[PDB]
Amino acid sequence: DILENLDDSVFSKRHAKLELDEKRRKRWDIQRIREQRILQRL
Amino acid sequence: DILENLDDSVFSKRHAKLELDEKRRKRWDIQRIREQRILQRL
Amino acid sequence: DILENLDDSVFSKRHAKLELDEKRRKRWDIQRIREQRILQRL
Amino acid sequence: DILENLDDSVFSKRHAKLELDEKRRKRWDIQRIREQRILQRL
Amino acid sequence: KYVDKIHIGNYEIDAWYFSPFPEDYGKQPKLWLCEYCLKYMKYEKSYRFHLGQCQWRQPPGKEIYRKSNISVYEVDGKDHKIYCQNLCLLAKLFLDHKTLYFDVEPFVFYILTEVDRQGAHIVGYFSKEKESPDGNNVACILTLPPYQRRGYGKFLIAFSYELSKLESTVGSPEKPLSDLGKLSYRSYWSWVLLEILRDFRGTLSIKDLSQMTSITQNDIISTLQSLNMVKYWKGQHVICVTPKLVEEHLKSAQYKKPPITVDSVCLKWAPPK
Amino acid sequence: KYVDKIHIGNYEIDAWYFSPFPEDYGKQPKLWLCEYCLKYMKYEKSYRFHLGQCQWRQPPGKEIYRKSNISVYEVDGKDHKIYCQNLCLLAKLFLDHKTLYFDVEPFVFYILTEVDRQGAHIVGYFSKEKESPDGNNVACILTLPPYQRRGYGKFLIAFSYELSKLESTVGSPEKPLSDLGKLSYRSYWSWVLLEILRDFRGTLSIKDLSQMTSITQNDIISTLQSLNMVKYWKGQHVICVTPKLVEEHLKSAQYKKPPITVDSVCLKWAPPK
Amino acid sequence: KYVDKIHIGNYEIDAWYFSPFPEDYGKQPKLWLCEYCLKYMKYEKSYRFHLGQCQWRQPPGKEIYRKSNISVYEVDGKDHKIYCQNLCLLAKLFLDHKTLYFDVEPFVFYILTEVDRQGAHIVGYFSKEKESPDGNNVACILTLPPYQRRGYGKFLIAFSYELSKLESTVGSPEKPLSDLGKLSYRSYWSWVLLEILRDFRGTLSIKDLSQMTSITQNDIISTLQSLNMVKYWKGQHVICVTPKLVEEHLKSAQYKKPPITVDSVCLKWAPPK
Amino acid sequence: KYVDKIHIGNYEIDAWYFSPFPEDYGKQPKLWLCEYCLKYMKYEKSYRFHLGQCQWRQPPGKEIYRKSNISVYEVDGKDHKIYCQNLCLLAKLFLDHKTLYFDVEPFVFYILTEVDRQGAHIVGYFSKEKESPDGNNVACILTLPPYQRRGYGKFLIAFSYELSKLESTVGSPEKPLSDLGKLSYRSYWSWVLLEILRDFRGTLSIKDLSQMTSITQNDIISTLQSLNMVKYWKGQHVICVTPKLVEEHLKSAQYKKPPITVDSVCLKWAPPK
Numbered sequence A, B, C, D: 001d002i003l004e005n006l007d008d009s010v011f012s013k014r015h016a017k018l019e020l021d022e023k024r025r026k027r028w029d030i031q032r033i034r035e036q037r038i039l040q041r042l
Numbered sequence E, F, G, H: 001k002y003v004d005k006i007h008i009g010n011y012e013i014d015a016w017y018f019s020p021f022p023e024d025y026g027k028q029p030k031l032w033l034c035e036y037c038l039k040y041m042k043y044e045k046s047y048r049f050h051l052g053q054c055q056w057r058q059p060p061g062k063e064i065y066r067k068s069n070i071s072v073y074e075v076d077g078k079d080h081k082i083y084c085q086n087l088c089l090l091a092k093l094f095l096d097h098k099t100l101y102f103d104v105e106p107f108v109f110y111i112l113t114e115v116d117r118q119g120a121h122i123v124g125y126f127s128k129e130k131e132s133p134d135g136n137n138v139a140c141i142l143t144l145p146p147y148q149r150r151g152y153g154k155f156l157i158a159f160s161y162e163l164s165k166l167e168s169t170v171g172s173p174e175k176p177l178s179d180l181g182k183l184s185y186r187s188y189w190s191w192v193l194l195e196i197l198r199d200f201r202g203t204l205s206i207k208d209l210s211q212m213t214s215i216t217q218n219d220i221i222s223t224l225q226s227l228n229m230v231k232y233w234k235g236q237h238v239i240c241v242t243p244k245l246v247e248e249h250l251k252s253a254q255y256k257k258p259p260i261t262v263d264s265v266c267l268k269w270a271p272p273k
């Protein structure tokens, strides 16, 4: 129906905040796994 | 309106399960505090 | 070399404190698993 | 005894890795506090 | 709050807070309580019946203090579970931060009573954990509302420390303290320290005061701070007691001799183990 | 490993793993065990004495299966604690991942025995949690080394499922399985499924097979995968059973009829509650 | 599942799973994707326009393998973020357990292509973490549905190990593997081990095999287990390879030479750092 | 403690606590600091050189307050990172519980200076988090030891609240407060409340006082408690202000007018966003 803008910058803009979401979730899991390993092994 | 049974056994029966509830919550908190102390102090 | 007392009570006495050790470790793991399940699933 | 380089860049270089250390510790504590709040309040 | 009023002995007392009286007893607007064994009831009929049936005229323990009409009873939570549980439910009505009601075996209870021809009538109490990880010589402390502001609260605190002294141990009430709890302790601590700082002819370190009174170094320091007897050098706080500061505070409202005092000779108690 | 050899009945059996036999019993190179009551001993003198003193010739439970010289006994951990604890210590010598030894009250034990004139001699067993949160119809399973590779392991597995069937429940062994555990179950599961897929004249969903056998849908699926009876469409796996695939696998080493089989008529057991 | 079909190049491919295409692109039933740069679109009009506008005929990386019409490209997620993110969104349509889509900087992507006059057309890929804490030489692996069951999957696995070999490192795919993933690896591992066990004139420990192939000791052991080349002594598993077992498995369906193989000479790649 | 003395401007100041000056600067017994840009140095030679080289005579921000010789500068941690980091290291020497030194971007710093012909000489400061989850209008607060007990501390507190007022927000210092911090705030709070309770002709709820002063309801309540202006009914505390209690406390040492006061007209600041 409508023509779409397929420039890189368009994709970079709608992916940037999702890229940050994953990075935060990855930090969460790294800490969560490290905490689990400390608590069980004593 | 109605006369109530004030024998010890009556109280012992309606307190027994509540006594067990608290004991379980006390075990929970002891473990929770011990886990918190281990995780922050490293 | 020496004759050993094989009465039940002998075994009951050297197992009692070990039986309590396991029960405590089982309460620990139940709580630990429940806590892990709550933290990851949100 | 010796003359010291007091340029900004000198300070920026010996502070950069310490600035990153604190940021990581701040992420750790934010997660640790959030996890504690979830576990106790149920 | 569902139960907001209780009838105990001849007192009608308005409840300050919620208390988790079990089942449908928690939902009643008023509860009737025996003043001797502390059992709770829904209806008045069962109360007027219980008066001529109950077999107690004292708390179920050893009388460990007697002077004049004041008696204190030691009740072990393991031996008289039901009684202490009932006491704890009663107590929660006036304590915002009381956590335990039914797990009473690890606790020992010291009941304050006024004694007459009829029996020993409960005035207040304090609870104490037998084995405290934090060294708490008091868990909860209470003077029932009709008996308040007579000095009985400061008696119970003074009593808790007398036990600690006889146990060669330091002690502190469970934190956090309520506003009335803070006022009561600070008032007691000031009086104890001022009496010592007035009479003692020698050098006193904060360590000594602790050993003399069973008050913790922390509670001593903050007491001295409020009595303006602490100066500050490079952040760290050092003791500075002068005869002027002692004299001035003795005449202030920050010094007040307790109306009722624990008399050591009238204590008939042996420490455990 | 400190104790690496045991003497039980007339067998000298080499220990596979560590077992936490209490106190100084854990440090001895060899232990003597009664074949009937399973009590452990340091010295041989006390063993030769115990033979003419022991009052058991069977495990301390109900005989719930009897065919030929095979008998199975049901022992409740609550009623015969000492026996089951001793069994668990014995069992740990051949199980790498056994966790429980002394908390035996929540468990029920099914002892496999060969019976002769002397008594009922222990061959192996499996343990089972009375109330399992994960639906485990087996916790640990064991055939003592001298009795291994006779079919007794596949009997015990088959036995555990017969119990599950009579309880109208599905069940699975506690994970993780050891390498010999995997081989034993996969062998049993294949045989059960192949026998059904050969004879049944009708439509079968994975759900039906589960209800017929008490094998979980998971264990059924992975069994069918290894029998090449699962095709793959858009990631998801769908059943594909053909008379050719059934025929071929019946002649393969992936099909083997158990040497010893549970005979349903010879089971004399009532399910609990 | 909202998007269940894609158009890429001249292929109409049905989606296997959900993929989190951003904003309102995730809600469309069909998406149009450029076969060269992998950008996604809502409408067909913008697709037919993009064909005569796009400036790529290959993946945006180094051609590190070329034999016949097969080429493999190495794309670094840091240098070509947008491309790899689009690839990851495409990839998720056929992977149930793919977790990462946008955090592509820590990853390096190896794209499998068939090359003709038009360009290099994407067949499949595997992703790899630059710094893997668990030593994963593959993160996700995929052959696009229209190209499946030609041998390309076993090529990509074989390719991932060739990289590991040239890095003097052992490696294993990220667990857990899907059912088709298990079949592909087990098939590859069997073939590699059987080729070695057929030709090698010497003593081989599991350690050596690992160093020769870059397959982990774990993956080697379980492969040998399925090839019946492991016996069991006191729980512990020891290698038992015989010329008979090798011969038999060479003729079985458990041995199959990959239709397409990595030719070492045709690899034009330098390992990092 | 390794560094126990600093030279800043013409002051020799003894350090109260440890400060994590990086690398080998943390191990030196004495450090030389520029009084304008706050850079730290190992040797005196580099200090005497820096005096005739440094390009600052003020903190690197906006002058937002000027009356007499007092000026206050607003320094944003994002714009002048190095300066604020140096300030934080300096500050830690006199603060036991300071946690942050290098992550200064989220913070804004308000520097108190005395101004003469030479420049603006640092007297003290307070830090403030731009986005505080707990509503902290002050993070750390400090008057350098040579300038202490002149009233400058009470000026900085008064200043922090003036900012809060102009932001239509309530605020509280980060807890816990040090002993000198408690004394300073309590002194300030008392003075503010007493000035209002003396002059206001109307009904005042604790809510109103909060809105008038930007002091939290908590800090207001505890202040009123110490001024004996709180009575206690059934546990809960209610305000009781009388002209007698106000009059008495105005003449006591619990009321003291700050030697140096923030003059609203002399503030030249716009609130953010």
Ligand SMILES: CC(=O)SCCNC(=O)CCNC(=O)[C@H](O)C(C)(C)COP(=O)(O)OP(=O)(O)OC[C@H]1O[C@@H](n2cnc3c(N)ncnc32)[C@H](O)[C@@H]1OP(=O)(O)O
Binding pocket: E094, E095, E138, E139, E140, E141, E142, E143, E144, E147, E148, E149, E150, E151, E152, E153, E154, E155, E173, E174, E176, E177, E178, E180, E181, E183, E184, E187, E253, E256, H231, H232, H233
């Ligand atoms: C360890 C804990 O459990 S903390 C919990 C403390 N207890 C509670 O909160 C339960 C309810 N409150 C109470 O039972 C009582 O208020 C107690 C136990 C704190 C004190 O009981 P009392 O017997 O009334 O105390 P007592 O008569 O010894 O007076 C102690 C001080 O408190 C002050 N005080 C007591 N009630 C009030 C009141 N309503 N208003 C103002 N001051 C009061 C008294 O003036 C006295 O101080 P002073 O020596 O400066 O005159």
Ligand SMILES: CC(=O)SCCNC(=O)CCNC(=O)[C@H](O)C(C)(C)COP(=O)(O)OP(=O)(O)OC[C@H]1O[C@@H](n2cnc3c(N)ncnc32)[C@H](O)[C@@H]1OP(=O)(O)O
Binding pocket: F094, F095, F138, F139, F140, F141, F142, F143, F144, F147, F148, F149, F150, F151, F152, F153, F154, F155, F173, F174, F176, F177, F178, F180, F181, F183, F184, F187, F253, F256, G231, G232, G233
């Ligand atoms: C739930 C859990 O507890 S998992 C733990 C499992 N048990 C253990 O690891 C404890 C030690 N091991 C054992 O007790 C036994 O090996 C058991 C229980 C696994 C099986 O006992 P057995 O009575 O020997 O098993 P059984 O004679 O029925 O044979 C079962 C299968 O295992 C195979 N097997 C048993 N031992 C071996 C061995 N040493 N090498 C190769 N195959 C073996 C048999 O060939 C048979 O497979 P098949 O039907 O394809 O021929």
Ligand SMILES: CC(=O)SCCNC(=O)CCNC(=O)[C@H](O)C(C)(C)COP(=O)(O)OP(=O)(O)OC[C@H]1O[C@@H](n2cnc3c(N)ncnc32)[C@H](O)[C@@H]1OP(=O)(O)O
Binding pocket: F231, F232, F233, G094, G095, G138, G139, G140, G141, G142, G143, G144, G147, G148, G149, G150, G151, G152, G153, G154, G155, G173, G174, G176, G177, G178, G180, G181, G183, G184, G187, G253, G256
């Ligand atoms: C590390 C991970 O990411 S695990 C995720 C694995 N990948 C996925 O699940 C994504 C979707 N699936 C795929 O992309 C493919 O199925 C892959 C990557 C597993 C294999 O791709 P292909 O190019 O089709 O594999 P290839 O042609 O090399 O065949 C490999 C083996 O799988 C078998 N196979 C592949 N598809 C099927 C199927 N639908 N049914 C039965 N067997 C199949 C083949 O028979 C072959 O085994 P064989 O050597 O015994 O004949």
Ligand SMILES: CC(=O)SCCNC(=O)CCNC(=O)[C@H](O)C(C)(C)COP(=O)(O)OP(=O)(O)OC[C@H]1O[C@@H](n2cnc3c(N)ncnc32)[C@H](O)[C@@H]1OP(=O)(O)O
Binding pocket: E231, E232, E233, H094, H095, H138, H139, H140, H141, H142, H143, H144, H147, H148, H149, H150, H151, H152, H153, H154, H155, H173, H174, H176, H177, H178, H180, H181, H183, H184, H187, H253, H256
């Ligand atoms: C939020 C936080 O960061 S809490 C940390 C607080 N700050 C610190 O601990 C850092 C080190 N200390 C300091 O910088 C100062 O002592 C400050 C900031 C607390 C106060 O600085 P100053 O400029 O000296 O305070 P100012 O001259 O306004 O006096 C404030 C009150 O403190 C009292 N005071 C200050 N120093 C002392 C001292 N050494 N002994 C007794 N009283 C003192 C004053 O008498 C005055 O009370 P008053 O009004 O009843 O007379």
Ligand SMILES: [Zn+2]
Binding pocket: E034, E035, E036, E037, E038, E039, E050, E054, E055, E056
């Ligand atoms: Zn009674």
Ligand SMILES: [Zn+2]
Binding pocket: F034, F035, F036, F037, F038, F039, F050, F054, F055, F056
């Ligand atoms: Zn025996």
Ligand SMILES: [Zn+2]
Binding pocket: G034, G035, G036, G037, G038, G039, G050, G054, G055, G056
């Ligand atoms: Zn394109």
Ligand SMILES: [Zn+2]
Binding pocket: H034, H035, H036, H037, H038, H039, H050, H054, H055, H056
């Ligand atoms: Zn400078």
